[PDB]
Design an enzyme around this catalytic site. Structure first.
Site, PDB file in Angstrom:
ATOM      1  CG  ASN A  42      35.114  21.037   3.667  1.00  0.00           C
ATOM      2  OD1 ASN A  42      36.181  21.448   3.206  1.00  0.00           O
ATOM      3  ND2 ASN A  42      34.868  20.944   4.966  1.00  0.00           N
TER       4      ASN A  42
ATOM      5  CB  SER B 160      37.149  23.430   6.012  1.00  0.00           C
ATOM      6  OG  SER B 160      37.010  22.093   6.459  1.00  0.00           O
TER       7      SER B 160
ATOM      8  CD  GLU C 271      27.525  13.827   5.325  1.00  0.00           C
ATOM      9  OE1 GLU C 271      27.921  14.844   5.921  1.00  0.00           O
ATOM     10  OE2 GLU C 271      28.265  12.867   5.048  1.00  0.00           O
TER      11      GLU C 271
ATOM     12  CG  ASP D 136      31.555  19.566   6.432  1.00  0.00           C
ATOM     13  OD1 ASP D 136      32.454  19.840   5.630  1.00  0.00           O
ATOM     14  OD2 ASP D 136      31.594  18.554   7.163  1.00  0.00           O
TER      15      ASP D 136
ATOM     16  CG  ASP E  94      40.225  21.066   7.333  1.00  0.00           C
ATOM     17  OD1 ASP E  94      39.190  21.620   7.769  1.00  0.00           O
ATOM     18  OD2 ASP E  94      40.271  20.564   6.179  1.00  0.00           O
TER      19      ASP E  94
ATOM     20  CG  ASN F  88      34.892  20.039   8.733  1.00  0.00           C
ATOM     21  OD1 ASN F  88      34.634  20.601   7.662  1.00  0.00           O
ATOM     22  ND2 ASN F  88      34.022  19.291   9.369  1.00  0.00           N
TER      23      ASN F  88
END
Length: 129
Positions: A59, A50, A35, A52, A48, A46
């Protein structure tokens, strides 16, 4: 902070992730490897809208507040910046909520694609724990 592998393993164990929701320490260390590459400061946008954050790439749509994510819920009740700290306490506490939310560690897409089903014990080899 960029953690060493055994350094991160020892901290995750101290904070109660070993066997948390039945997931062995090696699963958590492997998740963090893929990750964030063990970097607490990692961020990734991301599609959308958002983002991380941190060592476990938590998120901003459901879990932490970053002030710029539509539909944000902040279920861990924490600013996303707190997840970038050299102290992993806030990331671990939020990860415990995430892994308890119903789909287990499949919430971490790099865990599912790169760790699940593999010899995750290798991630804690050599470590004194």
């Amino acid at each position: 902070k960029v953690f060493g592998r055994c350094e991160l393993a020892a901290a995750m164990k101290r904070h109660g992730l070993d066997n948390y929701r039945g997931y062995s320490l090696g699963n958590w260390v492997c998740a963090a490897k893929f990750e964030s590459n063990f970097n607490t400061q990692a961020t990734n946008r991301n599609t959308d809208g958002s983002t991380d954050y941190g060592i476990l790439q938590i998120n901003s749509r459901w879990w932490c507040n970053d002030g710029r994510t539509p539909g944000s819920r902040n279920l861990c009740n924490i600013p996303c910046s707190a997840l970038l700290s050299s102290d992993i306490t806030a990331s671990v506490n939020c990860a415990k909520k995430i892994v308890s939310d119903g789909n287990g560690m499949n919430a971490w897409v790099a865990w599912r694609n790169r760790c699940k089903g593999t010899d995750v014990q290798a991630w804690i080899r050599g470590c004194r724990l």
